[PDB]
Amino acid sequence: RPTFYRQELNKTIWEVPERYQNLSPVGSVCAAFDTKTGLRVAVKKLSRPFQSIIHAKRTYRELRLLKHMKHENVIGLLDVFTPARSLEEFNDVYLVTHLMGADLNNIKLTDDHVQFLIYQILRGLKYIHSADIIHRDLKPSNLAVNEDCELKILDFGLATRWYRAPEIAANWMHYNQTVDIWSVGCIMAELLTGRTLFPGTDAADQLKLILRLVGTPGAELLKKISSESARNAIQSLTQMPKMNFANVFIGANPLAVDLLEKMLVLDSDKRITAAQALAHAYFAQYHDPDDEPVADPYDQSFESRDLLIDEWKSLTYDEVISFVPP
Numbered sequence: 001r002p003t004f005y006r007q008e009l010n011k012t013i014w015e016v017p018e019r020y021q022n023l024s025p026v027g028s029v030c031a032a033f034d035t036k037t038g039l040r041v042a043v044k045k046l047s048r049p050f051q052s053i054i055h056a057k058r059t060y061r062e063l064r065l066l067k068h069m070k071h072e073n074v075i076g077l078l079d080v081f082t083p084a085r086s087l088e089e090f091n092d093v094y095l096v097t098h099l100m101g102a103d104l105n106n107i108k109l110t111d112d113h114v115q116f117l118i119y120q121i122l123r124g125l126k127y128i129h130s131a132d133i134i135h136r137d138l139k140p141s142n143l144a145v146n147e148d149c150e151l152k153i154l155d156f157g158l159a160t161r162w163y164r165a166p167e168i169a170a171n172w173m174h175y176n177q178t179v180d181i182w183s184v185g186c187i188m189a190e191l192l193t194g195r196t197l198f199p200g201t202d203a204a205d206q207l208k209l210i211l212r213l214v215g216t217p218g219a220e221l222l223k224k225i226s227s228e229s230a231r232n233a234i235q236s237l238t239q240m241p242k243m244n245f246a247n248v249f250i251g252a253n254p255l256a257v258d259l260l261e262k263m264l265v266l267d268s269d270k271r272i273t274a275a276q277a278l279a280h281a282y283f284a285q286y287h288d289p290d291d292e293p294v295a296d297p298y299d300q301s302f303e304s305r306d307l308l309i310d311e312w313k314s315l316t317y318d319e320v321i322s323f324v325p326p
């Protein structure tokens with residue numbers, strides 16, 4: 001067991017191994033310097049991790065997910081620790097990740113640079129989707145970059161509905177992984193134009209802006225709508241055609257416009273997948289089909305289980321104890 005030290009910050013007493021130095025507020029998160037690896041890190045102290053069944057299952061879910069993620073373009077876990085010497089004492093969980101400089105909200109980009117950023121998102125997304133994980137909330141604030149434009153997908157703001165797929169915003173009961181490809185389309189459009197593609201002021205406005213670009217749903221899509229009231233609402237909309245994307249993204253690389261046309265499709269079954277998108281000619285200078293890895297199988301069967309707090313806590317403790325650093 002390493003040597004721990006205690007200090008007060010954020011009106012809580014953080015107790016961490018001495019390897020982690022100069023903690024400064026940025027659960028809650030402190031930036032730190034790890035003397036063992038020499039890395040700048042983010043240390044997240046989970047808030048009330050076992051206060052209820054719901055908190056405890058969320059704590060387990062977060063740790064399990066971070067432990068699985070092992071890809072250059074996805075945030076991974078550098079360390080997980082607790083001051084507790086036993087299950088009986090186990091009340092606090094701290095997660096350590098790479099400290100990222102900035103997010104994509106912070107950063108006109110050149111076409112070469114827009115290719116590089118979107119390539120990396122899709123490379124990461126290929127990996128996440130291969131594990132049968134759906135992100136659901138991809139947006140510029142969940143995309144971290146360093147000075148060298150190297151990008152990682154974050155689970156949460158750091159470890160707005162402008163970027164959400166329309167089926168999520170409309171409460172669909174079933175989801176494609178391609179909800180995330182919609183989000184990538186929105187992000188790419190914004191990197192091209194400098195402005196938010198669909199800056200809806202509320203859910204009605206958001207949907208109006210979307211349909212203005214992509215057109216109202218066609219008969220092929222209406223065939224797959226089980227909700228009677230949904231179909232009726234959709235067909236009572238004033239009808240409108242798909243816009244020509246070239247006339248929206250004036251001066252963009254034609255290959256960028258083509259890829260956007262393939263991402264920003266209302267019918268999720270007709271959207272390009274992350275794997276397919278990596279092979280699109282827009283990324284020719286970056287694409288390497290032998291260096292776009294996939295993930296080990298990820299067991300989410302726990303999501304279907306209903307357990308007691310102590311049970312979720314013991315499972316989380318097991319995952320802390322079994323952690324092996326990268």
Ligand SMILES: CCCCCCCCO[C@@H]1O[C@H](CO)[C@@H](O)[C@H](O)[C@H]1O
Pocket residue numbers: 166167170172174175176207217221224234266267268269
């Ligand atoms: C007018 C606004 C309505 C939004 C329509 C969103 C349609 C999304 O597309 C739908 O996604 C589903 C879930 O992945 C699939 O089961 C359907 O087959 C597919 O057509």
Ligand SMILES: CCCCCCCCO[C@@H]1O[C@H](CO)[C@@H](O)[C@H](O)[C@H]1O
Pocket residue numbers: 170171172173174224225226227229230233234237
């Ligand atoms: C004018 C706005 C039209 C949006 C329709 C919103 C209602 C969508 O309702 C959803 O429809 C899905 C498709 O059948 C179902 O999977 C979901 O269970 C249902 O919640």
